[PDB]
Design a protein around this nucleic acid. Structure first.
Ligand SMILES: Nc1ncnc2c1ncn2[C@@H]1O[C@H](COP(=O)(O)OP(=O)(O)O)[C@@H](O)[C@H]1O
Lengths: 586, 579
DNA sequence: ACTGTTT
DNA sequence: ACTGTT
């Protein structure tokens, strides 16, 4: 069971030295490692080479779904005959249940499930049991609560051809996973028994037809529900529960008894504290949910009662995707300096929101037990970890003994030239630079601190006659795609906005980045943000960065210096190999 | 009030003659009118001119949401100080309830509402009551069932600044909709009552609050509040509260059910009769308790106490008697509109036949085309290739063929099927050298998949377009083709939005004589148009026979290319590909 | 063809 | 900043 890397290309630039150093690290027993990979060096390809050499089930963590999406595409292209999986949240929209004490307002949980993503998540989890050649591209959804791996093996009806099973036990195993029997009104969530045939109906109007020989599964075939076309014949099939939670029916009565025991104890507490309104709200909400459970078996926000339903002790650590991975497994953190604080921050935020709900009698204290992992908990799972970032964070720096630099680009393209200009005459100067780039058919990206500052420059630039677009803080993964497209094609020559660190703004047509108020206090003015902003001008052979500031900040100095370092190393390699860099590549 | 058209540009080419002829038509009492506007002539502005001159509440119908979207943007730019509204379906996902007799399979209705679209629809409907300077860009959703505009006036709490209303009456008007009073647990669907203040937590996802400050019996101020922050999102002058979301109706359904049960039994349809009682009786108990049930829409005719057979209330009823309708791509929209009713009835009839629904379910339906025709006061069909309906109803056509850019309709060369590919290959190879792109149309997916695989073997950067492609995949594919990632596009349907790109200098119609929908007179004219954004735009038709369809297309192009060439002579214009 | 469509 | 979130 080995990873087969399918590429026409071979490692160029400093990818060979990087792979050798990172594979030796894993072999030598090094846990924490960091790849300092500049943008344009082929980070994914280096990683793919490492994944192949080390041959270990891997987990790729991305700080956003857009980035995760691209990585999945990139990895599926390199490993077509291996298990490349995608594990992200199945909610298309998720408004968590919350209380705003600031205004005495209660926000009910409102969410919408994407069934395609749910199918993908199932492909991912079940793949970890089948084979060792697995790569899972995931978001922070990998540190959130999931069922016990043993519980997963039990709650999934897996059927193979020529398998010995009594038609009647199959039915029991199906009812056990929330399916009903309906030979009269056949639909999603139900199964029907025609002859020596069981038809199972689990979105996507598809259904499994199991033909029985006597006590042996004679044949298994997929059918289109809307047409009745025999869509294809199968050898294996895994039926998943009809519900979105579906609790184990047996262990449910003790759980209801345990909640009532916690509720009574919490009421004596709230009363012997004078919190009477909160105590009234708690009884009303809890007692309702318990009656909904006794009747249906489910209730809205049943997840809050999770600790009691699994009969697990208080304080207990949740089961996560990380538990479905073997002891000997690798983790690769993309944009580590972003992901690490994100991962670290999910527990604190979750507890913060849930604590206010507890304090005001909306939920019992056991609600806090249904949570993502503590960073300490996540750390206990790190077997072999590789942090990937162009600007690694403090955590990665403290844990990596030696950095693994990958700064040389295959195209030979260099990191930009930074010129620092005064704030007095900022705009007129920038205007002249923008005007000059239009003449040369090049594009400009400008950053501000305030949205107001940004809108004002857009309105003035539009008055002069410059084709401009202002980037809003909240932009959809289409408005983005369209905006990058139009700037590339030339519908816009300049882009204004706070935050150029959005995906895909690294365009070959951009020859100038202008950082207005470079010396001012702001997140996007930090050493790391500046280095990342500078990188937006590096896809161009004549790439330049202009910093408008009166003072040179420690942040600016570091950024200016790191760029000098890299630009020099690259220029020295271009001398030794006789290369002249050319813009949009090839 | 009047429509104020805000444009920096003035009508060029044949736009002035078009506007004059179309405005005179409305004034002279016409009836039905058609605007034969070629792609690239600025049809929307001609329409905007007409909308301003005639000054009448208007409805724009588009055959797809993408096209509807662009038109809304275009109209919002021209009338910024008027009511430009968007009315399309609020469902992000809709699987209608259906039965598959071929396999005895029942498909439950599964839906998922887009709240932003719902807000937009409400802005549209309520705007029609407030002002006469309204333009509504809509899809076929405008011929589907809606509440009586009268029932709307009653079931919507509309509040204005000075106003004057009893604080207590406002509460009654809120409870009368579906609002509960909760000062203890304030949340979605409830109202509060603080001091001389009423805080209302509306319907969904925005997570906003309406704070009504009352000066004795006057509405002193109405201001929007961020529920998640407590932040005062902005001050308002008008606000419309929508519902949080009968006995005679329940009695009437039971009366229809009993009558339908005697019928079914007498015909021996016992399984269907069991299914009907079970389903109906359940829904009626759900209605007596809650007031709602899943699929309550099916009972709509009984709930409005209207007679059987009755025509539904539509967006068209909210418009004044004196109103205008503008049909974009009429040769596409008209058949669409006309086809709605037939499909709906077909699906609902099978459900009725098998005892899933009562026969009154058919009364909850879109409009009949005959019904829609009875609403036409002043109608303007806009199309580059008008359909038979528009042709039969328009007395005189209003042509707008002259482009401001001077760009001409392509040159069509007809080549034999024998040597089809080698010839096409040579033409594609030649365009790569000149940095131009190619679009190829086949009939079957085999021919399409097969040419892509062979062109990729030769070394041509190609992409095959799937029959099923999402809006993002479309936008991306075109983008990549413009930027040069691919030099050629292969596929069945080239009539997809935005496929007419300035970089494309060649359209190749493989099996041009082979007869299918996309080989019809009209389809060919639209396919030809994909090469008209280029100054050296050429079309190659691979066929052995010249079909009536081909002749018409070839001739209309000759006509339009000649008129344009003659205009370019008289005004001394040299066309340039604008990229 | 392909998109539209169910207070 | 901005995105994550059986
Ligand atoms: N040695 C190589 N030869 C050719 N292409 C390569 C090589 N290494 C990487 N690539 C490709 O170069 C592209 C650009 O690199 P980059 O923008 O840094 O993306 P990433 O870091 O995600 O791989 C990617 O499509 C990648 O697959």
């Amino acid at each position: 069971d080995r990873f087969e890397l399918v590429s026409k290309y071979q490692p160029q630039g400093d990818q060979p030295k990087a792979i050798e150093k990172l594979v030796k690290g894993i072999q030598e027993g090094k846990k924490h490692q960091t790849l300092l990979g500049a943008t344009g060096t082929g980070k994914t390809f280096t990683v793919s080479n490492l994944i192949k050499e080390v041959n270990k089930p891997t987990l790729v963590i991305a700080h956003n779904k857009t980035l995760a999406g691209q990585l999945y595409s990139e990895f599926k292209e390199f490993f077509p005959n291996n298990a490349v999986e995608y594990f992200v949240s199945y909610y298309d929209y998720y408004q968590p249940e919350a209380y705003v004490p600031q205004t005495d307002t209660f926000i009910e949980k409102d969410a919408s499930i994407n069934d395609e993503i749910d199918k993908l998540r199932h492909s991912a989890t079940s793949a970890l049991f089948e084979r060792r050649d697995v790569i899972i591209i995931a978001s922070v959804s990998c540190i959130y609560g999931l069922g016990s791996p043993e519980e997963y093996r039990e709650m999934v009806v897996s059927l193979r051809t020529e398998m010995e099973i009594e038609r009647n036990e199959l039915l029991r195993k199906l009812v056990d996973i929330q399916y009903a029997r309906n030979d009269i009104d056949f639909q999603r969530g139900t199964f029907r028994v025609r002859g020596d045939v069981v038809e199972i109906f689990p979105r996507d109007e598809h259904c499994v037809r199991v033909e029985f020989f006597g006590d042996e599964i004679e044949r298994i075939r997929e059918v289109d529900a809307l047409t009745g076309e025999i869509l294809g014949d199968r050898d294996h099939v895994a039926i998943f529960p009809a519900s979105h939670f579906v609790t184990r029916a047996e262990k449910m009565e003790k759980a209801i008894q345990n909640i009532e025991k916690e509720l009574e104890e919490q009421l004596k507490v709230m009363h012997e504290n004078g919190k009477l309104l909160e105590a009234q709200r708690l009884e009303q909400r809890t007692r309702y949910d318990l009656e909904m459970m006794r009747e249906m078996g489910f209730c809205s926000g049943i997840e809050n009662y999770s600790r009691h339903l699994t009969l697990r002790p208080p304080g207990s650590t949740p089961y996560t995707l990380l538990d479905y991975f073997p002891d000997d497994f690798m983790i690769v953190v993309d944009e580590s300096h972003v992901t690490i604080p994100q991962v670290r921050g999910m527990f604190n935020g979750d507890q913060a929101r849930k604590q206010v709900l507890v304090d005001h009698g909306f939920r019992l204290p056991s609600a806090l037990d249904n949570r993502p992992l503590r960073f300490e908990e996540f750390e206990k799972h790190m077997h072999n970890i590789v942090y990937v970032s162009a600007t690694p964070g403090p955590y990665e720096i403290e844990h990596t003994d030696e950095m693994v630099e990958q700064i040389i680009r295959p195209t030979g393209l260099l990191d930009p030239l930074i010129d620092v200009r005064p704030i007095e005459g900022q705009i007129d100067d920038l205007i002249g630079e923008i005007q000059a780039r239009i003449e040369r058919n090049e594009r400009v990206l400008v950053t501000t601190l305030t949205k107001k500052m940004s809108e004002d420059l857009t309105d003035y630039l539009k008055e002069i006659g410059i084709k401009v677009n202002y980037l809003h803080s909240e932009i959809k993964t289409l408005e983005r795609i369209e905006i990058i497209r139009d700037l590339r094609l030339g519908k816009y020559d300049v882009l204004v906005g706070i935050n150029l660190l959005r995906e895909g703004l690294d365009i070959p047509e951009v020859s100038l980045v202008a950082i207005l108020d470079a010396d001012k206090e702001g997140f996007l003015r930090s050493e790391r943000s500046l280095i990342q902003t500078i990188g937006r001008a590096a896809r161009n052979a004549e790439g330049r960065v202009i910093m408008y500031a009166d003072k040179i900040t420690k942040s600016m100095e570091i950024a200016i210096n790191e760029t000098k370092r890299r630009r020099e190393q690259q220029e020295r390699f271009n001398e030794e190999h006789g290369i002249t860099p050319k813009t949009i590549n090839k």
